[PDB]
Amino acid sequence: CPFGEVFNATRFASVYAWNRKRISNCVADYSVLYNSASFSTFKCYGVSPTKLNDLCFTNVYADSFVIRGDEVRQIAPGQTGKIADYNYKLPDDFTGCVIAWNSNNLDSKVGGNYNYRYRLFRKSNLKPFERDISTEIYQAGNCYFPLQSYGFQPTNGVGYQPYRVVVLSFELLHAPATVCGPKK
Amino acid sequence: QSVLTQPPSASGTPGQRVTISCSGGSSNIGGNPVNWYQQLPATAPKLLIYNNNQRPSGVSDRFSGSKSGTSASLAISGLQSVDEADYFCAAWDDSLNGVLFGGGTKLTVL
Amino acid sequence: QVQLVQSGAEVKKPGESLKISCKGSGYSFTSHWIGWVRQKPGKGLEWVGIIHPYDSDTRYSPSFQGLVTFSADKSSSTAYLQWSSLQASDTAIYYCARRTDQYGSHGMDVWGQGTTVTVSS
């Protein structure tokens, strides 16, 4: 299972370039992950967090990327916010879980870290699962970049600190499930 | 060519409603919204449908689309002799970072 | 009229260089991704790449990286597709593509009209 291999890959993709991944033929060893007291936000939807290990699904896609520390509050199915209209619109039929935690102490350096970006100007609201990498000039008339450098700092508070997030998404279609079999 | 399964040949009387079904991997149709296209022979292609139901400038109201997750359907009601063209279930996706294309849907009248 | 204009029917020799052109007119040129589209005759619709003309930002097919050479200039309002080496697999009708990025969806509403590059033997 390339799970923490996705998580502890030292660099991530951005919130607009959110990297889903194909997961199949695996054990359902989620329990040691939420017994590992290192993650912070534990919000599962459709299936109970302890019940994700028992019941198995198809179409596993983990969306791992970096967002702000106060904007995990804006992470919910159908919550309309700055993350929903421009970065990525979350689905209302979302069956899965979202997990975030801080690792700012290695993300931060003495100077302003200008490597990743975030979509502060997009043209109109997204659908579920939309990836628009169209980084064109913004007609707002007054014409700025559609992305901006994340101004973060170690002096910035934890709500203004970067979090590593993962969104496990499941879709039940006509196929046998390929995740459960562990803890049997 | 990408993994977007499309019927290459359709037919029907003038006035019929064809249903072009398309499916594949969830990174193709389930992730990004399915778009639809049409190319007349020995001409340029042309966009028909974007964002699973919305049309650009210059296409009629017969062209309608739907997306059911990774599945998709083009509905073209009331056929005429304009339907001598191959149709594409095709979308800009990040499966292999491309506007991934379909296998054509060319129709003739009989 | 928004149009990506490719030139007339193109003939050269293989192995050499050719920079085919695609003028962007009738619209704000560098506000849409411009997709270079391939069509070898008798095949399902083929793809090469798509390029933003601002700093030549590149989203291309990973199986032709470095073979096909792209450029797109704002002041010339022209996307340029170059091959430093031509072959028999290049012989195809090529199209351009203007993505309808107007507070709308993606799809490519305006296309190139089609230009065949050939070698005669």
Residue numbers in the entry:
A (entry chain D): 336 to 476, 487 to 529
B (entry chain L): 1 to 9, 11 to 30, 35 to 65, 67 to 73, 76 to 118
C (entry chain H): 1 to 9, 11 to 55, 58 to 68, 70 to 125
The authors write:
The spike glycoprotein is the major target for neutralizing antibodies, which makes it a key candidate for both vaccine development and immunotherapy. The most potent antibodies tend to target the receptor-binding domain (RBD) of spike and interfere with the binding of RBD with the human ACE2 receptor. We characterized B-cell-derived anti-SARS-CoV-2 RBD antibody repertoires from vaccinated and infected individuals and elucidate the mechanism of action of broadly neutralizing antibodies and dissect antibodies at the epitope level. The Fab-RBD crystal and Fab-Spike complex structures corroborate the epitope grouping of antibodies and reveal the detailed binding mode of broadly neutralizing antibodies.
A second cluster was defined by three antibodies (IW-11C, JL-2B and JL-8C) that failed to compete with classically defined Class 1 (FI-3A), Class 2 (C121), Class 3 (FD-11A) or Class 4 (EY-6A), but did compete with a subgroup of the defined Class 2/3a mAbs. We refer to these as Class 3b. Unlike these typical Class 3 antibodies, one of our Class 3b antibodies, JL-8C, recognizes a distinct epitope below the tip of RBD opposite to the epitope targeted by FD-11A or S309, with the footprint covering regions of 394–396, 464–472, and 481–484, which partially overlaps with the ACE2 binding site and is similar to the epitope of S2H97. The majority of Class 2/3a and 3b cluster mAbs did not compete for ACE2 binding to RBD. The Class 2/3 mAbs, including JD-2B, JE-4C, JL-2B, and JL-8C, neutralized BA.4/5 with IC50 values of less than 1.0 μg/ml and retained such IC50 values against XBB.1.5 and XBB.1.16.
